[PDB]
Curated annotation (Swiss-Prot):
It comes from Homo sapiens. The gene is RRM1. This is Ribonucleoside-diphosphate reductase large subunit. Transmembrane segments: none annotated. Keywords: Acetylation, Allosteric enzyme, ATP-binding, Cytoplasm, Deoxyribonucleotide synthesis, Disulfide bond, Nucleotide-binding, Oxidoreductase, Phosphoprotein, Primary mitochondrial disease, Progressive external ophthalmoplegia. The modification N6-acetyllysine is found at K17, K374.
């Protein structure tokens, strides 16, 4: 049997040498239980000659990690093997790789197909020395296995199926991609990224410093008008956006209900369902080729086609009445929620008979809607609770529709001055204005909240503010570098310049501080963290306004009137920051950006940094990551248990037997039990309340998943109405059950 070495040379597979390599990575490990030869034994078993050393290493790392259930130091050793491989794979000089990427010629086409932009290469080559030596390759070793594998599959640019970029190369590419000739700023961003203080969103990581760069890849659209021309103009837009791998939120309420008269053709409308089938199949077709585009459809509950809308995602159905590749969201007026709880009637309307209901919010809506009712301009009236039951039935079956409160969204938007906001995005965190001329764009990044806790269990608020300021500046440069799939998107971003800074590792930051998720300490830290993020962001935005002038539509906005987000929630901030001093700077110069903060799902990027997603509690203390499948214990809990000498094979078994819960294990002290409660054991009302409290400092919204183990109508009702009454903009993203 032979391995193929990196140099392409053939080497005899030898027990002693494989064992030997594993041995050298065992410094500080418990050798009474960790046995290098144990790994070598299982590796050599299923091993065929023609295997490469990179494959061998991968196998050995994956094997070491199944032996975690023999001793936890095996999991460390597995990472040590993976990182050892990562170091060997990380050409050594940055500018060299950039040339290789640019000079790439497709083999079966013969065509010069640069993988980086010429103008990026040019900047890199002009600044070779400074750029190449700024890179710290030891930072490649800071990841865990599962983060590395995510990077390796999608994020490191490959030459002919072989990875050419080290993680550090990718990061410097992004940095130069954002800052171009400002090498000072590029190096500051590279340092911040490589030391893991924050991350740019996947779109930016993918395409920064490439040709026609798609740096923002979430969008929002309103249906143009209620016509075949309008419907198909918007469809083209969505197709074009989806080709650029853009996710989309689409508002659809202006479209005539089923049975509505068409004066042109003397016929009757088919309503939303058949139209949404065209959008569904457009999502399946324009999926970048070979693999489906993702569109979230927004509907207001006064619309007559609401009940059929609520069914489009049901897996049991009728095919022609289904659109299971779309995602569904409600854009809900307060009036609906008030009629539900008072048990009144709800009127279903056709927007053609009752125009402008989507162009109007709050008291103006309730007034317009009430006069349509009084004029008898109503197609069908149901008890409001009947529609409510359909909503909760849909969520029990599918986890959707998402719940957005239209009046909350509009009453507390700094984009208020533009007109009524008709919808949110794919992920329900963005609240940005759309119109015929304007498709809104989400320009996104996240702060790694675990990084700001010190060795002394204190939170570094100053550092967080300072990193946030860089993030604002970076995202603001992205607005101008971005290649837009449609011109309405470009118009929108250049006019109002919104951005969306979010977070990851909230749960990790609580645990590192030793706070239970539900404790007074965590609830106060939660406010403080988000005050800080809002404060630094406004401050950076104000600085850019001093240097470049405010955004076009600044005059008339709430902030131009001295109104900040927490003013809109009637909240008084803590004493941590001087907001009076910030307001006085904003009164002087204005701000560069209409919106700033929007906690998104961090599915892919949180995995890379090794943080829990977003603002979310750990959903379990033991979970699996697919790469084969790998078993993972909550890394904070496992350390605690091993430090105390409590961890063993059956102890892992009993936690799996408890659905990832540790509450009923009698050997665990109660302070650990409260630290490591799962999301299924944490009060969802408390989650909702904590989101509302941080919400006062988020000028957009937040993708809030809700976890109810065994739902019924009473559970879902009381949580939705609680979220609504807290003032939440997004009451629920997904509903998770078990």
């Amino acid at each position: 049997m032979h391995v193929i070495k990196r140099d392409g040379r053939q080497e005899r597979v030898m027990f002693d040498k494989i064992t030997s390599r594993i041995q050298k990575l065992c410094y500080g490990l418990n050798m009474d239980f960790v046995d290098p030869a144990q790994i070598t034994m299982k590796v050599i078993q299923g091993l065929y000659s023609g295997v490469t050393t990179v494959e061998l290493d991968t196998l050995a790392a994956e094997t070491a990690a199944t032996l975690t259930t023999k001793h936890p130091d095996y999991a460390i050793l597995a990472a040590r093997i993976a990182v050892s491989n990562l170091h060997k794979e990380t050409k050594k000089v940055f500018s060299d790789v950039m040339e290789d990427l640019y000079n790439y010629i497709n083999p079966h086409n013969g065509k010069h197909s640069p993988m980086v932009a010429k103008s990026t290469l040019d900047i890199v080559l002009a600044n070779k020395d400074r750029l190449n030596s700024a890179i710290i390759y030891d930072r490649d070793f800071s990841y865990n296995y599962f983060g590395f594998k995510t990077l390796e599959r999608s994020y490191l640019l490959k030459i002919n199926g072989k990875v050419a970029e080290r993680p550090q190369h990718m990061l410097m590419r992004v940095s130069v991609g954002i800052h171009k000739e400002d090498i000072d700023a590029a190096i500051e961003t590279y340092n911040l990224l490589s030391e893991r203080w924050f991350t740019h969103a996947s779109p930016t990581l993918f395409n920064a410093g490439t040709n026609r760069p798609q740096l923002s890849s979430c969008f929002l659209l309103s249906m143009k008008d209620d016509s075949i021309e309008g419907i198909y103009d918007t469809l083209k837009q969505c197709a074009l956006i989806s080709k650029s791998a853009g996710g989309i939120g689409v508002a659809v309420s202006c479209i005539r209900a089923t049975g509505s008269y068409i004066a042109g053709t003397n016929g009757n409308s088919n309503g939303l369902v058949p139209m949404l089938r065209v959008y569904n199949n457009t999502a399946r077709y324009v999926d970048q080729g070979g693999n489906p585009g993702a569109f979230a459809i927004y509907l207001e509950p006064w619309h007559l086609d609401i009940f059929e809308f609520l069914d489009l995602k049901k897996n049991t159905g009728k095919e022609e009445q289904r659109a299971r590749d779309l995602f569904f969201a409600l854009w809900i007026p307060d009036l609906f929620m008030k009629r539900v709880e008072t048990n009144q009637d709800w009127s279903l309307m056709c927007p053609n008979e009752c125009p402008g209901l989507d162009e109007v919010w709050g008291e103006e809506f309730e007034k317009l809607y009430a006069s349509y009712e009084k004029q008898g301009r109503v197609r069908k009236v149901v008890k409001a609770q009947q529609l409510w039951y359909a909503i909760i039935e849909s969520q029990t079956e599918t986890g959707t529709p998402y719940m957005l409160y239209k009046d909350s969204c509009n009453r507390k938007s700094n984009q208020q001055n533009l007109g009524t906001i008709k919808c949110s995005n794919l992920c329900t965190e963005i609240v940005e204005y759309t119109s015929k001329d304007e498709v809104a764009v989400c320009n996104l990044a996240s702060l790694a909240l675990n990084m700001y806790v010190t060795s002394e269990h204190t939170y570094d608020f100053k550092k967080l503010a300072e990193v946030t300021k860089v993030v604002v500046r970076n995202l603001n440069k992205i607005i101008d570098i971005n290649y837009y799939p449609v011109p309405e998107a470009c118009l929108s971003n250049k006019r109002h310049r919104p951005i969306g800074i979010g977070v990851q590792g909230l749960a990790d930051a609580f645990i590192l501080m030793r706070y239970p998720f539900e404790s007074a300490e965590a609830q106060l830290l939660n406010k403080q963290i988000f005050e800080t993020i809002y404060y630094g962001a406004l401050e950076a935005s104000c600085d850019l306004a001093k240097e470049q002038g405010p955004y076009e539509t600044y005059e008339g906005s709430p902030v131009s009137k001295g109104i900040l987000q927490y003013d809109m929630w009637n909240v008084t901030p803590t004493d941590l920051w001087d907001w009076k001093v910030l307001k006085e700077k904003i009164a002087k110069y204005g701000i560069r950006n209409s919106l700033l903060i929007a906690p998104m799902p961090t599915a892919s990027t949180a995995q890379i940094l090794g943080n829990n997603e977003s603002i979310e509690p750990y959903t379990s203390n033991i979970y699996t990551r697919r790469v084969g499948e790998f078993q993972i214990v909550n890394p904070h809990l496992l350390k605690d248990l091993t430090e105390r000498g409590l961890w063993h094979e059956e102890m892992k078994n009993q936690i799996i037997a408890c659905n990832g819960s540790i509450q009923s294990i009698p050997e665990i002290p109660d302070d650990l039990k409260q630290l490591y409660k799962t999301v299924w054991e944490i009060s969802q009302k408390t989650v909702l309340k904590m989101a509302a409290e941080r919400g006062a400092f988020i000028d957009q919204s937040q993708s809030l998943n809700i976890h109810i183990a065994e739902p019924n109508y009473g559970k879902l009702t009381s949580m939705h109405f609680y979220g609504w009454k807290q003032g939440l903009k997004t009451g629920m993203y997904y509903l998770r059950t078990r």
